Scaffold this active site. Structure first.
Site, PDB file in Angstrom:
ATOM      1  N   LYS A  18     -41.901  20.385  30.423  1.00  0.00           N
ATOM      2  CA  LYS A  18     -43.259  20.220  30.930  1.00  0.00           C
ATOM      3  C   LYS A  18     -44.050  19.275  30.030  1.00  0.00           C
ATOM      4  O   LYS A  18     -44.521  18.220  30.469  1.00  0.00           O
ATOM      5  CB  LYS A  18     -43.966  21.574  31.030  1.00  0.00           C
ATOM      6  CG  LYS A  18     -43.260  22.579  31.926  1.00  0.00           C
ATOM      7  CD  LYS A  18     -44.081  23.845  32.099  1.00  0.00           C
ATOM      8  CE  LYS A  18     -44.184  24.614  30.793  1.00  0.00           C
ATOM      9  NZ  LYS A  18     -42.850  25.064  30.308  1.00  0.00           N
ATOM     10  N   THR A  19     -44.184  19.664  28.767  1.00  0.00           N
ATOM     11  CA  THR A  19     -44.888  18.863  27.773  1.00  0.00           C
ATOM     12  C   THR A  19     -44.201  17.514  27.576  1.00  0.00           C
ATOM     13  O   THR A  19     -44.863  16.487  27.409  1.00  0.00           O
ATOM     14  CB  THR A  19     -44.968  19.601  26.423  1.00  0.00           C
ATOM     15  OG1 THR A  19     -45.570  20.888  26.614  1.00  0.00           O
ATOM     16  CG2 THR A  19     -45.792  18.806  25.426  1.00  0.00           C
ATOM     17  N   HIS A  78     -46.068  30.861  29.752  1.00  0.00           N
ATOM     18  CA  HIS A  78     -46.337  31.343  31.101  1.00  0.00           C
ATOM     19  C   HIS A  78     -47.657  32.100  31.204  1.00  0.00           C
ATOM     20  O   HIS A  78     -48.355  31.996  32.211  1.00  0.00           O
ATOM     21  CB  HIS A  78     -45.191  32.236  31.581  1.00  0.00           C
ATOM     22  CG  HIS A  78     -45.468  32.927  32.878  1.00  0.00           C
ATOM     23  ND1 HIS A  78     -45.215  32.344  34.104  1.00  0.00           N
ATOM     24  CD2 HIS A  78     -45.971  34.155  33.148  1.00  0.00           C
ATOM     25  CE1 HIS A  78     -45.554  33.179  35.066  1.00  0.00           C
ATOM     26  NE2 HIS A  78     -46.013  34.290  34.513  1.00  0.00           N
TER      27      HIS A  78
HETATM   28  N1  LIG Z   1     -31.249  17.082  26.066  1.00  0.00           N
HETATM   29  C1  LIG Z   1     -32.443  17.006  26.702  1.00  0.00           C
HETATM   30  N2  LIG Z   1     -33.457  17.803  26.276  1.00  0.00           N
HETATM   31  C2  LIG Z   1     -34.671  17.768  26.875  1.00  0.00           C
HETATM   32  C3  LIG Z   1     -34.877  16.847  28.001  1.00  0.00           C
HETATM   33  N3  LIG Z   1     -36.151  17.011  28.405  1.00  0.00           N
HETATM   34  C4  LIG Z   1     -36.712  17.956  27.606  1.00  0.00           C
HETATM   35  N4  LIG Z   1     -35.830  18.405  26.693  1.00  0.00           N
HETATM   36  C5  LIG Z   1     -36.079  19.437  25.656  1.00  0.00           C
HETATM   37  O1  LIG Z   1     -36.845  20.527  26.170  1.00  0.00           O
HETATM   38  C6  LIG Z   1     -37.619  21.074  25.100  1.00  0.00           C
HETATM   39  C7  LIG Z   1     -38.870  21.767  25.630  1.00  0.00           C
HETATM   40  O2  LIG Z   1     -39.931  20.862  25.924  1.00  0.00           O
HETATM   41  P1  LIG Z   1     -41.019  21.299  27.029  1.00  0.00           P
HETATM   42  O3  LIG Z   1     -40.376  22.153  28.095  1.00  0.00           O
HETATM   43  O4  LIG Z   1     -41.667  20.081  27.642  1.00  0.00           O
HETATM   44  O5  LIG Z   1     -42.095  22.148  26.185  1.00  0.00           O
HETATM   45  P2  LIG Z   1     -43.083  23.194  26.911  1.00  0.00           P
HETATM   46  O6  LIG Z   1     -44.042  22.453  27.812  1.00  0.00           O
HETATM   47  O7  LIG Z   1     -43.866  23.946  25.863  1.00  0.00           O
HETATM   48  O8  LIG Z   1     -42.279  24.174  27.733  1.00  0.00           O
HETATM   49  C8  LIG Z   1     -37.920  19.915  24.163  1.00  0.00           C
HETATM   50  O9  LIG Z   1     -37.774  20.333  22.804  1.00  0.00           O
HETATM   51  C9  LIG Z   1     -36.885  18.859  24.501  1.00  0.00           C
HETATM   52  O10 LIG Z   1     -36.029  18.630  23.377  1.00  0.00           O
HETATM   53  C10 LIG Z   1     -33.723  16.010  28.407  1.00  0.00           C
HETATM   54  O11 LIG Z   1     -33.817  15.203  29.355  1.00  0.00           O
HETATM   55  N5  LIG Z   1     -32.575  16.144  27.727  1.00  0.00           N
HETATM   56 MG   LIG Z   2     -45.491  22.990  26.149  1.00  0.00          MG
END
Ligand SMILES: Nc1nc2c(ncn2[C@@H]2O[C@H](COP(=O)(O)OP(=O)(O)O)[C@@H](O)[C@H]2O)c(=O)[nH]1
Ligand SMILES: [Mg+2]
Lengths: 392, 162
Positions: A18-19, A78
């Site tokens: 998401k972030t 969430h």
């Molecule tokens: N390997 C991989 N990891 C990803 C990708 N996109 C996001 N991530 C991982 O997902 C993790 C969570 O990020 P995110 O869901 O946006 O944070 P949140 O918004 O707090 O839930 C990050 O630490 C990224 O390393 C991707 O395309 N490939």
């Molecule tokens: Mg986040």
């Protein structure tokens, strides 16, 4: 160039990107259509927003497209999404459902779609994240069909819903191998431009003004004072007094702001409108002045409610079937019964549930209307009208 | 969308019928992994532990106040395990474990004894229903299949429990 504002946000399961998709969006929009990029760490470390209720860790970012200006909202957890969505604290004219294709749909995904339906999020664009970790296109197809099934499940046009395949991380790092990188996010923004409709301005909405107080002078007449929420009221215009009792028909003979007598009263202004041939016994509090046939009173309705925890000033005790808390609608207090969902008869302070409220008095209301729930005059919860239950 | 192909994908990739079920499945597994990472060790073992958990039935993380009496089956002369049971009337096979275990120093095979524990502190525990697993451990030669119908508790904080 001229670009109008549109409110969006990222919703989905934890660690689905998401972030990451937010940072990717601001980065790509900054590099392509121009603007100021944002940092992943700043958004992830979402600062507490104090609001008027429970503290919700919410990150606001902004990015411009070719034809629009986008105000985006992201949340770490969430619970933040629950509090932020159920309450008015964040308004989304469009929602971006990011789902990890490598992991597939998850509880909070379906729950966020459900919350989007209940709270009144009208449009959802799906971004299938982490498409870089998947070599098999058939899996992407399957997950696509799954999220489409979820959307169709909660009255979202999943068959026509634009689904975009890509990777927020691969897009943020600026590589765009194949079609997954900055090209995909660009197509996402373009999809936001082409699919999500423009928000109706509050001044273009039908007239709606919650009556705050009523002044009546036998021979002279009665003026009702309050703050105009929607639309514009003009002199010699017909208006409906809706709520509490039978809907009444009247005509605005004058608009008064402080000393001034105005040609009209627009939204956002605190005014007092003179009602012709009306009496104080005819007008009460909580009733609203509205454009004829735009609003109606209701007693029984299905809604989504969030109960405040003990820490944030909520109660120390769960609910029953015979609970009769006070319901605060716009400018009034109204006692109403509540029916709990199937399989549940006890809900702890801090939970969010689908509750069926049956008021003792009809209130002029619409779908999506946020309301308060109070005990002894102090807020114990907050909710939003999910759907009006008709009696016919 | 035309079916059959959806069925093709569901059957191909593991999916079984209703989406909600597999979603809850994934959620429970995620909860288990999150617990294992969050609390103490998360190495190779976490997977083997994971094999022992049934995710079709809900597996939830819970915090337990002190004074709660829980019990566990352990082999004679064996060190305190990490797994615990709520009720004494639960059969060993139901917990996904062999009724009997190996007894060191003696090196002999002996019936596992139920031991009663009380909580001396507030401890974090991972509630879960046992999976039907094969129990090659605690018997050097015998590999023991288990019914796995009963609930389990997991906490690496042995000092807090024992
Ligand atoms: N390997 C991989 N990891 C990803 C990708 N996109 C996001 N991530 C991982 O997902 C993790 C969570 O990020 P995110 O869901 O946006 O944070 P949140 O918004 O707090 O839930 C990050 O630490 C990224 O390393 C991707 O395309 N490939
Ligand atoms: Mg986040």
């Amino acid at each position: 160039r001229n670009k109008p504002h549109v409110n969006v946000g990222t919703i989905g399961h934890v660690d689905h990107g998401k972030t990451t998709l937010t940072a990717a969006l601001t980065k790509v929009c900054s590099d392509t259509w121009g603007g100021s990029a944002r940092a992943f760490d700043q958004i992830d470390n979402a600062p507490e927003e104090k609001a008027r209720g429970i503290t919700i860790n919410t990150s606001h970012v902004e990015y411009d497209s070719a034809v629009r200006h986008y105000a985006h909202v992201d949340c770490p957890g969430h619970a933040d999404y629950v509090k932020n969505m159920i309450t008015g604290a964040a308004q989304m004219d469009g929602a971006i459902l990011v789902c990890s294709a490598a992991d597939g749909p998850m509880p909070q995904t379906r729950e966020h779609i459900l919350l989007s339906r209940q709270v009144g999020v009208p449009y959802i664009v799906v971004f299938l994240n982490k498409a870089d970790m998947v070599d098999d296109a058939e899996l992407l197809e399957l997950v696509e069909m799954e999220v489409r099934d979820l959307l169709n499940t909660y009255d979202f046009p999943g068959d026509d819903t634009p689904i975009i395949i890509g990777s927020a991380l691969m897009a943020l790092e600026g590589k765009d191998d194949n079609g997954i990188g900055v090209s995909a996010v660009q197509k996402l923004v373009e999809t936001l431009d082409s699919y999500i409709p423009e928000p109706v301005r509050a001044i273009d909405q039908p007239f709606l003004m919650p009556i705050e107080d009523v002044f009546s002078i036998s021979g002279r007449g009665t003026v009702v004072t309050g703050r105009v929420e929607r639309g514009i009221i003009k002199v010699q215009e017909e208006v409906e007094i809706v709520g509490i009792k039978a809907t009444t028909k009247t005509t605005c003979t004058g608009v008064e702001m402080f000393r001034k007598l105005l040609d009209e009263g627009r939204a956002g202004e605190n005014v007092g409108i003179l009602l012709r041939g009306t009496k104080r016994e005819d007008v009460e509090r909580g009733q609203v002045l509205a454009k004829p046939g735009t609003i109606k009173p209701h007693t029984k309705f299905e809604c989504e409610v969030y109960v405040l925890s003990k820490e944030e000033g909520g109660r120390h005790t769960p609910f029953f079937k015979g609970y009769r808390p006070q319901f605060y609608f716009r400018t009034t207090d109204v006692t109403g019964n509540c029916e709990l969902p199937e399989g549940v008869e006890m809900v702890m302070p801090g939970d969010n549930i689908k509750m069926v409220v049956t008021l003792i008095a009809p209130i002029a209301m619409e779908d999506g209307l946020r309301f308060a729930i109070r005990e002894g005059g102090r807020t114990v919860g907050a909710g939003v009208v999910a759907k009006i239950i008709e009696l016919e | 969308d035309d079916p059959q192909r959806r069925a093709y994908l569901n059957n191909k990739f593991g999916r079984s019928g209703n989406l909600d079920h597999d979603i809850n499945y994934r959620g429970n597994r995620e909860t288990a992994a999150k617990f294992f990472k969050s609390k103490d060790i998360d190495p190779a073992d976490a997977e083997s532990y994971m094999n022992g958990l049934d995710f079709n039935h809900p597996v939830r993380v819970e915090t337990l106040a002190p004074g709660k009496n829980l019990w566990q089956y352990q082999s004679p002369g064996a060190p305190q395990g990490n797994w615990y049971t709520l009720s004494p009337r639960v059969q060993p096979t139901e917990l996904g474990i062999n009724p009997m275990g190996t007894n060191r120093a003696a090196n002999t095979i002996e019936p596992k004894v139920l031991n009663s524990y009380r909580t001396t502190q507030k401890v974090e525990v991972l509630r879960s229903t046992a999976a039907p697993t094969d129990d090659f451990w605690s018997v050097k030669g015998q590999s023991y299949p288990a019914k796995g119908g009963a609930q389990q508790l997991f906490s690496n904080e042995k000092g807090s429990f024992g």
